[PDB]
């Protein structure tokens, strides 16, 4: 229903999370 | 959706955490 | 039901943790 | 059912999370 | 429980994250 | 259903983040 873009906005968050992690990993070298 | 409500709060918290990770990464360089 | 309530709490923990990381980041600058 | 101690083991995790945060906050002074 | 399965994976990840936060705290002192 | 799948992914992100924090902690020691 409208728990449907619940999951959509969470999927975006998870993606932002991944980009952020990648940047930190790269800083740790 | 109530449950949906929670998932929206989670997504927003996740984004903020991701942005904090980026600030950490930049402080390292 | 109680699952909803649990996920809200995870959300607050992540938010509080974000704040702490900003502080750490600032300390690492100087 | 046996999503019942699902939530129980998650409640414990959340508590560990809080203790960990408190210790970091205290280190940041 | 499958959904229950996920919640168990989450709890374990949360614990590991909490323990990493403590290691961070101790490194500061 | 798809909620289950989503929560699994959060779990992996938290696990990967934990590793990164251990590395940061080690770097802060020296």
Residue numbers in the entry:
A (entry chain C), B (entry chain B), D (entry chain C), E (entry chain B): 1 to 29
C (entry chain A), F (entry chain A): 1 to 30
From the reporting publication:
CCs are quaternary structures comprising two or more α-helices supercoiled around each other with cyclic (Cn) or dihedral (Dn) symmetry. Here, we describe variants with all combinations of the aliphatic residues, Ile, Leu and Val, at a and d to give four classes of peptide: the ββ class, with a and d = Ile or Val; Lβ, a = Leu and d = Ile or Val; βL, a = Ile or Val and d = Leu; and LL, a = d = Leu. Peptides are named systematically appending the one-letter code for the amino acids at the a and d sites to “CC-Type2-“; e.g., CC-Hept becomes CC-Type2-LI. In summary, solution-phase data and X-ray crystal structures demonstrate conclusively that different classes of Type-2 coiled-coil (CC) peptides—i.e., based on abcdefg repeats with predominantly hydrophobic residues at a, d, e and g—adopt a range of distinct states.
Specifically, we mutated the centremost Leu at d (position 17) to Glu to give CC-Type2-IL-Sg-L17E and CC-Type2-LL-L17E. However, unlike the parents, they had accessible thermal unfolding transitions. Both transitions were pH dependent with stabilities increasing sharply below pH 6–7. We confirmed the likely involvement of Glu-17 with a pH titration of CC-Type2-LL-L17Q, which only started to unfold at pH 3.
